[PDB]
C-alpha cells in the first residue's frame, strides 16, 4: 500500500568516535542523538545492552543522553555503545565507539614502606644508600613521578627520576645520630599536579 521508510541516525560521531571525559559528573548531558525519518514519524530513542544501559540514560523524545554512573579511565578506557531509534514500525541500531578521556585524578602511591636504612658514619660522599618507589596510573605527564626531599637536606640528595638516595656530605655520628626526611612524590600534570609524602628514616651507626 504505502511501505514504511525506516529512520537513520545523523550524528557525526557514529562515523568516528565520541570522547567523554572521566570527570564528567553523573547527570550531565553527554550528547544528543539525532535521527531523520522521511515519513516524519514520531521517533523513540534508546540504548541497548546491559553494560551500556547502566552507564547511560536516554531521554526518549528529545534524544539527550545522560551519564548515570561515574566513568573511570583507570578502570575502563572505552566502550562500544549500541543506540537505537524506532518509529513504531521498526527499530534501527548503530554502534558508537566511546573513548574515555583521562584527567589527573590520582596522586602517586609509595611502595615498600616503611622506609628505613642503616648506614655507617664513614659512608663516602656519593654512595647510593636507598631507593624509593611510587607509581601513578594516570596517563602521560600526570603519571610520571618526580621525587624530592621536603625540604632538601644538606646530608642527602634524591635523584628526581630514579628515587635513588645518595649521601652528599660527610656524616658525623656525634653531631647527629638519626635523620627523619620527608620524601615527596609528585606527578607532572601541567595545571593540576598531585603528590604524596613518605617518611625516610636514616639511622647512623658508629665505628669507634
Amino acid at each position: 500500500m504505502q511501505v514504511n521508510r525506516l529512520p537513520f541516525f545523523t550524528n557525526h560521531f557514529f562515523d568516528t568516535y565520541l570522547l567523554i571525559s572521566e570527570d564528567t559528573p553523573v547527570g550531565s548531558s553527554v550528547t544528543q542523538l539525532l535521527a531523520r525519518d522521511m515519513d516524519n514519524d514520531p521517533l523513540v530513542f534508546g540504548v541497548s545492552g546491559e553494560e551500556a544501559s547502566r552507564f547511560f540514560a536516554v531521554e526518549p523524545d528529545t534524544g539527550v543522553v545522560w551519564l548515570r554512573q561515574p566513568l573511570d579511565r583507570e578502570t575502563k578506557s572505552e566502550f562500544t555503545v549500541e543506540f537505537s531509534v524506532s518509529d513504531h514500525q521498526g527499530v534501527i541500531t548503530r554502534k558508537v565507539n566511546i573513548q574515555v578521556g583521562d584527567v589527573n585524578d590520582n596522586a602517586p602511591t609509595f611502595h615498600n614502606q616503611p622506609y628505613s636504612v642503616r648506614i655507617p658514619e664513614n659512608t663516602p660522599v656519593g654512595t647510593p644508600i636507598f631507593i624509593v618507589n611510587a607509581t601513578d596510573p594516570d596517563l602521560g605527564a600526570g603519571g610520571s613521578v618526580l621525587y624530592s626531599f621536603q625540604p632538601p637536606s644538606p646530608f642527602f640528595a634524591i635523584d628526581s627520576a630514579r628515587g635513588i638516595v645518595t649521601v652528599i656530605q660527610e656524616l658525623d655520628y656525634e653531631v647527629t645520630q638519626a635523620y627523619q626526611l620527608t620524601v615527596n612524590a609528585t606527578d607532572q600534570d601541567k595545571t593540576r599536579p598531585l603528590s604524596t609524602l613518605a617518611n625516610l628514616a636514616i639511622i647512623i651507626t658508629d665505628l669507634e
Binding site: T16, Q99, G101, D102, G140, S144, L146, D159, R162
Partner: protein
Amino acid sequence: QYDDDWQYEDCKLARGGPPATIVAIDEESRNGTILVDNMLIKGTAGGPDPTIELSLKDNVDYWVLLDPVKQMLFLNSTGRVLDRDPPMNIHSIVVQVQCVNKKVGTVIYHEVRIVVRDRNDNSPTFKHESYYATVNELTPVGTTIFTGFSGDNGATDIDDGPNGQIEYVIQYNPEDPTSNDTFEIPLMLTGNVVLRKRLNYEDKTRYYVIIQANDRAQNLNERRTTTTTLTVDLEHH
C-alpha cells in the same frame, strides 16, 4: 627555587588537550598511511643535540612505525591487511610513545589509541545454495508460505552494524514472469514470503521466486547484494 625547571619541560606535550592521542582509520587501509601527523611532544629527537629519546612500547604485532625526528606514526601492514571483521577482529590498536628526557632521565608515556572503522567490504552470504517451499493450492491469499530465512538460515553478513544487516526483496524473473506477482515480501527485514494471488494446480505447479539479499550500508551505492532462488511447488487437493 625551581630555576632549572625548563630542563624538565622536554617530553611534555607541546599541544594542549587531554593526554591520550586518539585517531581513527578505516580497516584495510594501505601500508604507510599516516596515523598521526605529528605527536607534538616538546623537545627534539635527532638534530645536532637531541634533548629526547622517542620509541614505541606495547606495539603488539608491529602495526605502528615511528619516525622519531618528525614524530610521525605510520601504519605498517606490508604482506597483510588490517581486518576489523572476523576472524581478525581488530577494532582498536593501543600503543605507547615512550619519551625519555635526556637531560634529567624522566620518562613519560604518551598513549596512542587508534579506532578502526568498519568498511562494507563483505557481501551477504546465504547459508544454503537454494531454498524451497511446498504450498497447498487451496492456501488463501495473505498466508505466509516461506519462513526459511529465519534464525540465520538465510543471509548473513560478517560486517558490523547496518553493513551487516540484511533486506530481502523479490526480483522479477524473466524465466518465470508471474512469480514476483504471486508472492511478496511485506517485511524486507524478515524475508518471509506470503501468497499474493490465488493458486491453481491445474494451470501452474511451480514458481521460481528470485530473492535478492542486500546489506544496509549508509551510502546506497556502497551496498552489496546476493541472489538466491526460492522454488515453490504446489501440492494437490
